[PDB]
Amino acid sequence: MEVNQLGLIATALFVLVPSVFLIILYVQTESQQK
Amino acid sequence: MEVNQLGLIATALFVLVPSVFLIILYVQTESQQK
Amino acid sequence: LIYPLGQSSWFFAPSFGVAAIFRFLLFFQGFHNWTLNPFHMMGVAGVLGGALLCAIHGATVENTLFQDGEGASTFRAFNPTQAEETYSMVTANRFWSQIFGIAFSNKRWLHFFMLFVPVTGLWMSAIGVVGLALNLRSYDFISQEIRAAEDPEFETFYTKNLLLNEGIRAWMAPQDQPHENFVFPEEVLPRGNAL
Amino acid sequence: METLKITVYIVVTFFVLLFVFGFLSGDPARNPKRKDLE
Amino acid sequence: ANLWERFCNWVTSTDNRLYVGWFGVIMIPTLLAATICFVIAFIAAPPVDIDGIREPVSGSLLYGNNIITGAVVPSSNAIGLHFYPIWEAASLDEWLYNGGPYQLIIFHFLLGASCYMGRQWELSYRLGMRPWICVAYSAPLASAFAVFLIYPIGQGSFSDGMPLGISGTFNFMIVFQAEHNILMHPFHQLGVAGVFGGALFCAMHGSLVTSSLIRETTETESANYGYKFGQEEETYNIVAAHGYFGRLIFQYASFNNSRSLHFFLAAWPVVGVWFAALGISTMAFNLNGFNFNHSVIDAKGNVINTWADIINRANLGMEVMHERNAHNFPLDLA
Amino acid sequence: MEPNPNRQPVELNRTSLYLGLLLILVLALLFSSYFFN
Amino acid sequence: YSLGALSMMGFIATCFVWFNNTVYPSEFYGPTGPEASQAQAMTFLIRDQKLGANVGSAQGPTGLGKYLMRSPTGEIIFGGETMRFWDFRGPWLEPLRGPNGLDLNKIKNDIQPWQERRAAEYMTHAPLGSLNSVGGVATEINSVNFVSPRSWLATSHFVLAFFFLVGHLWHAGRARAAAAGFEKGIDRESEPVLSMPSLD
Amino acid sequence: AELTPEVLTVPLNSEGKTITLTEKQYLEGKRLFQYACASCHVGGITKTNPSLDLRTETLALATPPRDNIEGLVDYMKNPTTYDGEQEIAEVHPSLRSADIFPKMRNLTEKDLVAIAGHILVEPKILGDKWGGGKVYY
Amino acid sequence: ELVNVVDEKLGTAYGEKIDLNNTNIAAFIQYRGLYPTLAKLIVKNAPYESVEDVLNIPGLTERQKQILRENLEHFTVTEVETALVEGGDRYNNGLYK
Amino acid sequence: TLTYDDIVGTGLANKCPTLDDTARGAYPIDSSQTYRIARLCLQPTTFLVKEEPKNKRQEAEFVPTKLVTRETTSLDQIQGELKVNSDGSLTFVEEDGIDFQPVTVQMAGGERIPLLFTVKNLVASTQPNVTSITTSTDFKGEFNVPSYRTANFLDPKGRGLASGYDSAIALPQAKEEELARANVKRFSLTKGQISLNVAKVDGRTGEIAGTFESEQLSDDDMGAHEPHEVKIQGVFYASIEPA
Amino acid sequence: METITYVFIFACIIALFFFAIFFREPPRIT
Numbered sequence A, B: 001m002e003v004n005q006l007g008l009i010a011t012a013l014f015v016l017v018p019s020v021f022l023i024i025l026y027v028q029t030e031s032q033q034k
Numbered sequence C: 001l002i003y004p005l006g007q008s009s010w011f012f013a014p015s016f017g018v019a020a021i022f023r024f025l026l027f028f029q030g031f032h033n034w035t036l037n038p039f040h041m042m043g044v045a046g047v048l049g050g051a052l053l054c055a056i057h058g059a060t061v062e063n064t065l066f067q068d069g070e071g072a073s074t075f076r077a078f079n080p081t082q083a084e085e086t087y088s089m090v091t092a093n094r095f096w097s098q099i100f101g102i103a104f105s106n107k108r109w110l111h112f113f114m115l116f117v118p119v120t121g122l123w124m125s126a127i128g129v130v131g132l133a134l135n136l137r138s139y140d141f142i143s144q145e146i147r148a149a150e151d152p153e154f155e156t157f158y159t160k161n162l163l164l165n166e167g168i169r170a171w172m173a174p175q176d177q178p179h180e181n182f183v184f185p186e187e188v189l190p191r192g193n194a195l
Numbered sequence D: 001m002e003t004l005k006i007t008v009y010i011v012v013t014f015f016v017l018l019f020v021f022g023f024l025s026g027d028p029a030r031n032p033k034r035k036d037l038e
Numbered sequence E: 001a002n003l004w005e006r007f008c009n010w011v012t013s014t015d016n017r018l019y020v021g022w023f024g025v026i027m028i029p030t031l032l033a034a035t036i037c038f039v040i041a042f043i044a045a046p047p048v049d050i051d052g053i054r055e056p057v058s059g060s061l062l063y064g065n066n067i068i069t070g071a072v073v074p075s076s077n078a079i080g081l082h083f084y085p086i087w088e089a090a091s092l093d094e095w096l097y098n099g100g101p102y103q104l105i106i107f108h109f110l111l112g113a114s115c116y117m118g119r120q121w122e123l124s125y126r127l128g129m130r131p132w133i134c135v136a137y138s139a140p141l142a143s144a145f146a147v148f149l150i151y152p153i154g155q156g157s158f159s160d161g162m163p164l165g166i167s168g169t170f171n172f173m174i175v176f177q178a179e180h181n182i183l184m185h186p187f188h189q190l191g192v193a194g195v196f197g198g199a200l201f202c203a204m205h206g207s208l209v210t211s212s213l214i215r216e217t218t219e220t221e222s223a224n225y226g227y228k229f230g231q232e233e234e235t236y237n238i239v240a241a242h243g244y245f246g247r248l249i250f251q252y253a254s255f256n257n258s259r260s261l262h263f264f265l266a267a268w269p270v271v272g273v274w275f276a277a278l279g280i281s282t283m284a285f286n287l288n289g290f291n292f293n294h295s296v297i298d299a300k301g302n303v304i305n306t307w308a309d310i311i312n313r314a315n316l317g318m319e320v321m322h323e324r325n326a327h328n329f330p331l332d333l334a
Numbered sequence F: 001m002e003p004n005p006n007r008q009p010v011e012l013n014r015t016s017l018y019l020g021l022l023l024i025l026v027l028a029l030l031f032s033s034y035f036f037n
Numbered sequence G: 001y002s003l004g005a006l007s008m009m010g011f012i013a014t015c016f017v018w019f020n021n022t023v024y025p026s027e028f029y030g031p032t033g034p035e036a037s038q039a040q041a042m043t044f045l046i047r048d049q050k051l052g053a054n055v056g057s058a059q060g061p062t063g064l065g066k067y068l069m070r071s072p073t074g075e076i077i078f079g080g081e082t083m084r085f086w087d088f089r090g091p092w093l094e095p096l097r098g099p100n101g102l103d104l105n106k107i108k109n110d111i112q113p114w115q116e117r118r119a120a121e122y123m124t125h126a127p128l129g130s131l132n133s134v135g136g137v138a139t140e141i142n143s144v145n146f147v148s149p150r151s152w153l154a155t156s157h158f159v160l161a162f163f164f165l166v167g168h169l170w171h172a173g174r175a176r177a178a179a180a181g182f183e184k185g186i187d188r189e190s191e192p193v194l195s196m197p198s199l200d
Numbered sequence H: 001a002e003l004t005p006e007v008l009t010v011p012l013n014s015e016g017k018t019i020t021l022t023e024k025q026y027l028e029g030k031r032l033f034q035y036a037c038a039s040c041h042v043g044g045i046t047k048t049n050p051s052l053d054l055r056t057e058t059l060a061l062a063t064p065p066r067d068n069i070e071g072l073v074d075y076m077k078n079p080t081t082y083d084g085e086q087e088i089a090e091v092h093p094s095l096r097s098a099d100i101f102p103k104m105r106n107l108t109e110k111d112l113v114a115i116a117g118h119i120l121v122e123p124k125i126l127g128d129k130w131g132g133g134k135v136y137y
Numbered sequence I: 001e002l003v004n005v006v007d008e009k010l011g012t013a014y015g016e017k018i019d020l021n022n023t024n025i026a027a028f029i030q031y032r033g034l035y036p037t038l039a040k041l042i043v044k045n046a047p048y049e050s051v052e053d054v055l056n057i058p059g060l061t062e063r064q065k066q067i068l069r070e071n072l073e074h075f076t077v078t079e080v081e082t083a084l085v086e087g088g089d090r091y092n093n094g095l096y097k
Numbered sequence J: 001t002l003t004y005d006d007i008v009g010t011g012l013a014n015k016c017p018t019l020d021d022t023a024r025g026a027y028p029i030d031s032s033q034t035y036r037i038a039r040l041c042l043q044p045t046t047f048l049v050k051e052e053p054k055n056k057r058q059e060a061e062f063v064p065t066k067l068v069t070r071e072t073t074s075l076d077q078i079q080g081e082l083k084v085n086s087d088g089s090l091t092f093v094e095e096d097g098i099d100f101q102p103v104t105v106q107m108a109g110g111e112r113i114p115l116l117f118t119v120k121n122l123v124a125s126t127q128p129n130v131t132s133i134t135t136s137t138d139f140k141g142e143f144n145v146p147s148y149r150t151a152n153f154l155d156p157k158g159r160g161l162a163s164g165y166d167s168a169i170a171l172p173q174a175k176e177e178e179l180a181r182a183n184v185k186r187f188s189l190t191k192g193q194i195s196l197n198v199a200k201v202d203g204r205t206g207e208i209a210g211t212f213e214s215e216q217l218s219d220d221d222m223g224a225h226e227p228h229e230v231k232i233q234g235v236f237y238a239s240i241e242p243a
Numbered sequence K: 001m002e003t004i005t006y007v008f009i010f011a012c013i014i015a016l017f018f019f020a021i022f023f024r025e026p027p028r029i030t
């Protein structure tokens, strides 16, 4: 299909960037003192 | 120029994935007790 | 306000009427393909999701009540000034955890979420309509059109819906938009076989 | 396709029998409070 | 305990991470079959001759669809209400061409969701709860029954069931408007009041409870931490909430009884959606929306259009264009 | 559940972060030309 | 239990009045939906054949027979959308039925005026109409005051059967809770879940 | 606009004679048409044969001519195909076939005149809508 | 070089008159006395090399012959177009109101 | 004697009548008598499609296919004149009947091949001097294959021949030339050929049965693509009558 | 590549369901 050839990178960064932001925040939360 | 149209996402993920891994590790290291 | 302001005139705003509003809906389908618009889709998710949360929360509270009276009708067994929760959060949480897999455990979160979902939905829909003011629609998938253009055996529900849209436009436009002085000869009207 | 048919028929019958005999197996008694409902 | 006794104890066990139960014994395999078939079809199913006119419609991703356009396509109009399990086909290729996945999926789904509802009762019983959460769930469930089973029955074909897809959903809606003028049907209007109202009261309730949370935290932390799971004391001040909302409108328009309030919260969307469902299910037998076409006439007899007639023109566009190759005769009678 | 005693904290100091980012970015700068080809 | 049973019976009655034309004679209740769609196909087969059409060999736009085609098991049936209704059976149509379905020679030679009349009548009394009883498709103009009895009875009984199913769930669940003694709520000092182990 | 005597003035015969219907006759005509005809002829079309409509010009070109009271009344007594060649009372409602079309049994000559008048007056009001079908709704 | 044959046919006499070889039968309703009897006979006995050949259809009455003669000025003939005459489309071309 | 209720939903309705093994007789032809086939039935059992040559340009073969449109394939209740020619050959001139069926078959790999399986306007003739129809009689002749879709058929973007848009309206400013083949619908009309091989004859009843093979083009989607070559094989039945 | 993306995102969502259910932070009564 003649899709937009940037759709792949757009979707991939759309998922990855905020997901990564959240994982960073979660993981640095867990490692704080109990 | 007739470049490989996946070069962009390849380079982007190549940079971003391990960089993110390291940022996660650093930040969860900083948040650890001193 | 914004929508008609982006269009030719107030004429294309919704008219304040039941049937008129319905007309507004069908116009948006035929002309904007508004169902295909992901902002509208988020609106839908927020509205139906809000109704879901409303129903499920009401029912959950009503079915995890503590017995605080002798009455079989349980409404009187509550006092506005009472300190205690009127229903069991713990039992509710176990119920949904075992039924659905996850459950609220935090009432403040639950209720903020009940605010968040429908408000956000409506806001997304507002953004989409802002797009429609400029006719900046999600009308088409270009890949779909290129494929269908080259391949007359290629059919999806998307293309079928566009046929529906085209019908709506041609059949309703002359009476719906009288200022255009549309005259559409019988022969130009899009129609399938028989109908 | 006959074998698939027979297999599905058997599976369905199996789970249905589990459902029915299951609810027949003193279900009213399976609650945290008053069990003597017979 | 013997093996059967032990099995019964496990099935109905309140300690399982996910409750199984006897309804669950039916629900699990049917929902798994339906899910697996749906996913596989959605990715890989070939085009389906939905309308029985040897005009196959592609629903799957690999055959040129995206997430919005994709669907599992309804079974052939040639099949109608005939039961078309895999084993009635001469081959899987035939089964696929004629839309067998649609029937397999929707039948397993409807069975499974009915069992989901029963399962909600069952667990409510096991936990010593009141039993009516499942009745609330009867509202969306009935609606699914309306679009996957009752409408097809009324029209005489599963080809008229709602497609399992986003754009296919829209197709179903537009065609439904064309054929029943659903917008002008009071049960659908009650449905709309139900979901708009449901959302309104959800946001409202959310906002008032959030508005009257008792200070238990500092500004540098989330207020959610002000509530601890399972605490006995209520986490907000309902008297203050009622004090606010009662002044916003007027005193007696506000709930001071949390139980009455939550009952209202349950009932409005559930009842409204029950009416939506009954709307679909009765338009299934072509008792359709209000028809005020040419209701207004001047002294000579000239037709004076109202908004109903413009609706009518749109509806006409829909009617004449849908399934452009399926009709040989002038009236669309089902 | 009874906790696992084999658990260890994990660390990456700032210098190691900078070194790692340098490695990744320079590798990307080198290979990117070949990815685009 | 009785509510459940009555709900079931309601749905059964709904399908009975919608499809059955024996204990619900079309003479009295009007044609079924299938009946009327088939009647349309019959009507135009008759019309066009009178005009000289060879209705057996007439190929429609789709490749399927315009008037006549095969069911998925090979039976000769009316074509177009009414393909879905080939299971329909009615006294006005059956004389045209042979071992293999609709018989082309009977169609060509044996259709009686009473059949044309009946097919036209049923076609034009199809069970379609608005809530204010304007007969026909949703886009039809005001003129005909008609909603088929089949529609009134099917719709009414679906609504009734559904609410009776709801009543069934309500009362079965309440009977269970009351029998077990918690229909009024959870005992604060004896909350069952509090005596259950945590899920995780 | 009003339903004037002029609108209600329609051709009685093929010989230039007209008849002016009363408002009550027009109403009776609408009522009786709905009662006996509209199931198939709603809006001036023909559901069981859309090739033939109730437009005045079409009636004018029918054989014998039907674009007048007399033609239509005779049709209601003894309907023919459009060319007059065969009598179709057996498949079309008429006084002659009131036995098989029972709604025609209580129709009087006056009723036939009223129905005919409805058929001729309606297009004078509705224009292309009469016999136009869904396109003109 | 691809051509829509129906559109192309509309530029011949087919687009101006009743084409005895191609036009769908309902067109005969346009003129007094032609439908359905003569219409049926005409379509059934098509194609015709010339318009006047319509007078040679067997079984005609003198009346029928005269009506046809009065209506010859409204008829034409062009080459049979497969697209217009297959499918029994001359009897029902999928057009109603 | 079977009724509709005996037959309905069994699949038998898509089957042609058979004659038992004892039916090896001869049906005399009186060359002074006129004859008709009152019922010709064709029940396909196999559809074969000629693979498109890779480019080797050797002999491309006919390969098997899977029927996906179920038991909707047979031609039946076909009738027509059976002429006795001056050289004693018989010529069947098809007049009418259910003489076509749309059929979709599926090739290995998934390609679907729609075709209008048909014998429309069949003209089939025997060898000369057939004084009796026997298990040695054969019919060979040709038929018409009209476009699988007729002229009103609309493609998914609303384009058609006798109806529809004449352009790609979703691409208002695309260059038209590259889309011409899709925009401009064409109506196919081609020839097919069929052989009927009589295997059984009931001299007393005038019934004959045997096997057939036909060759014809498949659907070309109103000129959008090249059609495939199809060979259909199956059994047939005909009842001969004096008329 | 589109299909891969869509199915990938879906699979990620299902896996997310799995973790969100079986590896959630447990609710604790204080």
Ligand code: CLA
Residues within 6 Å of the ligand: C024, C025, C026, C028, C029, C033, C034, C035, C040, C043, C044, C047, C048, C121, C122, C125, C126, C127, C129, E173, E195, E196
């Ligand atoms: C699943 C089905 C579905 C759902 C759930 C929705 C839901 C939504 N659609 Mg809809 N829609 C659908 C299908 C659906 N749509 C379809 C099939 C179409 C055809 C294409 C449309 C076409 C459509 C359009 C064209 C529009 C919507 C809108 C919206 C939103 C309306 C929000 C609202 O309540 O505004 C209601 C109004 C308000 C909230 C404004 C404030 C109202 C004040 C407070 C009222 C005060 C009243 C006062 C007290 C006096 C009352 C007096 C009394 C006598 C009446 C909402 C997100 C709208 C939207 O997207 O807007 C952004 C919109 O314009 N939809």
Ligand code: CLA
Residues within 6 Å of the ligand: D007, D008, D009, D011, D012, D013, D015, D016, D017, D019, D020, E025, E026, E027, E028, E029, E030, E033, E083, E084, E085, E086, E087, E103, E104, E105, E107, E108, E111
């Ligand atoms: C919960 C278990 C379950 C259930 C309920 C079903 C149910 C269904 N599946 Mg199956 N299915 C299952 C598991 C299950 N499936 C599994 C695990 C697989 C993978 C192997 C499949 C694979 C599968 C396939 C491949 C197909 C189905 C299909 C079918 C349907 C037809 C079955 C039938 O004809 O049975 C006949 C059996 C009976 C009538 C049972 C009679 C015997 C009992 C003892 C008498 C009492 C029953 C009576 C009716 C009343 C019910 C009792 C009630 C009052 C409590 C049906 C919707 C088909 C389908 O969906 O077609 C569209 C189909 O194609 N299923």
Ligand code: CLA
Residues within 6 Å of the ligand: D012, D015, D016, D017, D019, D020, D023, D027, E026, E114, E115, E117, E118, E121, G001, G004, G005, G007, G008, G168, G169, G171, G172, G173, G175, G176
């Ligand atoms: C959605 C429909 C539904 C649901 C959720 C329930 C659920 C409930 N019913 Mg039931 N019930 C129903 C319909 C339903 N009923 C109907 C239609 C009838 C009339 C025949 C009854 C008659 C009934 C009685 C007489 C009783 C119950 C009971 C109850 C409750 C106790 C559970 C019970 O023992 O299961 C029984 C479940 C059923 C009788 C039907 C469940 C149907 C669902 C769809 C499961 C189908 C499973 C089946 C094996 C799959 C078929 C596969 C096929 C291919 C072979 C419970 C609240 C009992 C109760 O405690 O009441 C106070 C009780 O004694 N019900």
Ligand SMILES: CC(C)=CCC/C(C)=C/CC/C(C)=C/CC/C(C)=C/CC/C(C)=C/CC/C(C)=C/CC/C(C)=C/CC/C(C)=C/CC/C(C)=C/CC1=CC(=O)C(C)=C(C)C1=O
Residues within 6 Å of the ligand: C041, C042, C043, C045, C046, C049, C050, C052, C053, C056, C057, C058, C060, C061, C089, C092, C093, C096, C097, C100, C102, C103, C104, C105, C110, C116, C117, C118, C120, C121, C124, E039, E040, E042, E043, E067, E165, E166, K006, K007, K010
């Ligand atoms: C093979 C593959 C590719 C198949 C995929 C194809 C198929 C089409 C996939 C679908 C694609 C996709 C999902 C379509 C939807 C996309 C889009 C429309 C989403 C909208 C996006 C979103 C940002 C919109 C913004 C508006 C807003 C945020 C909407 C969110 C809606 C939200 C989820 C509503 C909540 C519904 C959910 C069920 C709530 C659960 C809560 C539940 C636990 C309550 C139980 C409960 C109640 C109590 O009262 C108490 C007390 C307790 C304790 C308790 O527990």
Ligand SMILES: CC(C)=CCC/C(C)=C/CC/C(C)=C/CC/C(C)=C/CC/C(C)=C/CC/C(C)=C/CC/C(C)=C/CC/C(C)=C/CC/C(C)=C/CC1=CC(=O)C(C)=C(C)C1=O
Residues within 6 Å of the ligand: E201, E204, E205, E206, E208, E209, E238, E241, E242, E245, E246, E249, E253, E254, E255, E256, E261, E264
């Ligand atoms: C220039 C001019 C002259 C200026 C002069 C101004 C002068 C000072 C004015 C003074 C005189 C004045 C009074 C004359 C008035 C003029 C005129 C009457 C104005 C009318 C304006 C307007 C149109 C009136 C609309 C009527 C009204 C607003 C309709 C909406 C209200 C609606 C019907 C409420 C009923 C619904 C009810 C069920 C809601 C409950 C559901 C939901 C809220 C549950 C959530 C919830 C509820 C709780 O209860 C609590 C507790 C909690 C927890 C909670 O979750």
Ligand SMILES: CCCCCCCCCCCCCCCC(=O)OC[C@H](CO[C@@H]1O[C@H](CS(=O)(=O)O)[C@@H](O)[C@H](O)[C@H]1O)OC(=O)CCCCCCCCCCCCCCC
Residues within 6 Å of the ligand: C073, C074, C075, C076, E190, E191, E193, E194, E197, E257, E259, E260, E261, E263, E264, E267, E268, E269, E271, E272, E273
């Ligand atoms: C002119 C017409 C002729 C008449 C014909 C009659 C028609 C039938 C009318 C139907 C009768 C309804 C009875 C309601 C009783 C009831 O609910 O009691 C339960 C409680 C009792 O009230 C609570 O009552 C309690 C005391 S007690 O329980 O009553 O003893 C008290 O503690 C508490 O504060 C108080 O709120 O009611 C409430 O919780 C608040 C009212 C909520 C509204 C209920 C209706 C359901 C939602 C509407 C449906 C949606 C429709 C729109 C579609 C979107």
Ligand SMILES: CCCCCCCCCCCCCCCC(=O)OC[C@H](COP(=O)(O)OC[C@@H](O)CO)OC(=O)CCCCCCCCCCCCCCC
Residues within 6 Å of the ligand: C058, C059, C062, C063, C072, C073, C074, C075, E130, E132, E133, E135, E136, E263, E266, E267, E270, E271, G174, G183, G184
């Ligand atoms: C009496 C009429 C019943 C109408 C249908 C049911 C409506 C309410 C049920 C909704 C289910 C939601 C999920 C369960 C949530 C749930 O758990 O509710 C719990 C709530 C409280 O339970 P109780 O135990 O205190 O009372 C129920 C019995 O135990 C009797 O005491 O039950 C009721 O209030 C029933 C209300 C009957 C009276 C209400 C009538 C209101 C509807 C009137 C119809 C108007 C429609 C017109 C449209 C225009």
Ligand SMILES: CCCCCCCCCCCCCCCC(=O)OC[C@H](COP(=O)(O)OC[C@@H](O)CO)OC(=O)CCCCCCCCCCCCCCC
Residues within 6 Å of the ligand: C099, C100, C101, C102, C103, C104, C105, C106, C107, C109, C110, C113, E018, E224, K010, K013, K016, K017, K020, K021, K024, K027
């Ligand atoms: C029979 C078994 C049925 C199993 C089916 C699987 C059900 C899966 C339920 C959702 C799992 C993921 C939840 C993540 C998030 C999560 O882990 O939830 C956990 C969360 C717990 O809330 P708590 O009160 O405990 O936490 C509050 C504090 O953390 C405040 O921060 O529950 C909610 O937030 C409910 C509201 C959101 C409910 C979202 C439901 C959406 C359903 C699916 C929508 C996407 C569809 C995509 C299709 C392709």
Ligand SMILES: CCCCCCCCCCCCCCCC(=O)OC[C@H](COP(=O)(O)OC[C@@H](O)CO)OC(=O)CCCCCCCCCCCCCCC
Residues within 6 Å of the ligand: B017, B018, B021, B022, F011, F012, F013, F015, F016, F017, F019, F020, F021, F022, F023, F024, F026, F027
């Ligand atoms: C298919 C799925 C793929 C996802 C996986 C993600 C991939 C993650 C890859 C991880 C790599 C990160 C490297 C850690 C980098 C880092 O942490 O180094 C510093 C580190 C020192 O470790 P220490 O023993 O001192 O402990 C410090 C701890 O805090 C480390 O956690 O030494 C090593 O890691 C060994 C490798 C030396 C690397 C030195 C090379 C840097 C020199 C500059 C090179 C570029 C410029 C050249 C100019 C010509």
Ligand SMILES: CC1=C(/C=C/C(C)=C/C=C\C(C)=C\C=C\C=C(C)\C=C\C=C(C)\C=C\C2=C(C)CCCC2(C)C)C(C)(C)CCC1
Residues within 6 Å of the ligand: D019, D020, D021, D022, D023, D024, D025
């Ligand atoms: C007259 C009629 C006739 C006959 C009738 C018949 C003879 C029928 C019958 C009888 C019968 C024979 C009926 C029925 C069925 C029964 C029921 C409906 C059952 C149910 C079941 C249940 C409900 C149970 C529940 C549950 C179980 C499941 C499990 C456990 C628990 C419990 C027990 C709860 C005919 C049709 C021929 C024709 C028409 C008319």
Ligand code: OEX
Residues within 6 Å of the ligand: E051, E077, E155, E159, E160, E175, E179, E322, E323, E326, E332, E333, E334, G081
């Ligand atoms: O298939 Mn689906 O949509 Ca119920 O209407 Mn008739 O069919 Mn077809 O047209 Mn319109």
Ligand SMILES: [Ca+2]
Residues within 6 Å of the ligand: J135, J136, J137, J197, J198, J199
């Ligand atoms: Ca031989």
Ligand SMILES: [Cl-]
Residues within 6 Å of the ligand: C160, C161, C164, E171, E175, E321, E322, E323
């Ligand atoms: Cl459609």
Ligand SMILES: [Cl-]
Residues within 6 Å of the ligand: E326, E327, E328, E329, G079, G080, G081, G082
């Ligand atoms: Cl049809």
Ligand SMILES: [Cl-]
Residues within 6 Å of the ligand: none
């Ligand atoms: Cl006309």
Ligand SMILES: [Fe+2]
Residues within 6 Å of the ligand: E209
């Ligand atoms: Fe609450």
